Structures are given as structure tokens and as C-alpha cells.
């Protein structure tokens, strides 16, 4: 875990978003611009599936999330939740 994703945020940013991961709708999530359309219902379908994110690189699981994508997302929703 030294070389996660999550090592680029501090503790309380990590909580943030995933609190957000974790709690929003999909209509929610699209005001996330890089989350509009399927990724959106994606994140909130693998939540119900497999259970809440416990940490960010658990994003790489889902759908239409690669490494990059997933840390311009966490980036938003950290600035603008």
C-alpha cells in the first residue's frame, strides 16, 4: 500500500471522497463531470455488489476506471463535493 493511489492524499481527503463514493446517488455523481453517463451508475452498482469502497484504489475494480482516471475523479470530488 506504500505505492496506492490513496498514498497521494492525506487521510482526511481520502474520507471525503470516499464518503462521497460511498453515499451519492448516480444523479449526484454526474455533477462530476468526468463521472457523467455510465461511470456514474457504475460506481453505484459495484457499491451494492461488493460493499462500500474501503480505499481508492478499489476504484480500479470498476468499470471504465484505469489508474489516471481514477485519481482525476478522486481529485474532483475532493474540490467540489
Not at 482526511?12 to 454526474?30: F, G
Amino acid at each position: 500500500p506504500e505505492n496506492a493511489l490513496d498514498k497521494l492524499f492525506s487521510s482526511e481527503q481520502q474520507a471525503s471522497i470516499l464518503h462521497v463514493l460511498n453515499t451519492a446517488s448516480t444523479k449526484e455523481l454526474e455533477a462530476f463531470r468526468l463521472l457523467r453517463g455510465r461511470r456514474s451508475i457504475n460506481i453505484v452498482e459495484h457499491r451494492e455488489n461488493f460493499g462500500p469502497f474501503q480505499n481508492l484504489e478499489s476504484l480500479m475494480n470498476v468499470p471504465l476506471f484505469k489508474y489516471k482516471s481514477t485519481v482525476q475523479v478522486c481529485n474532483s470530488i475532493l474540490h467540489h463535493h
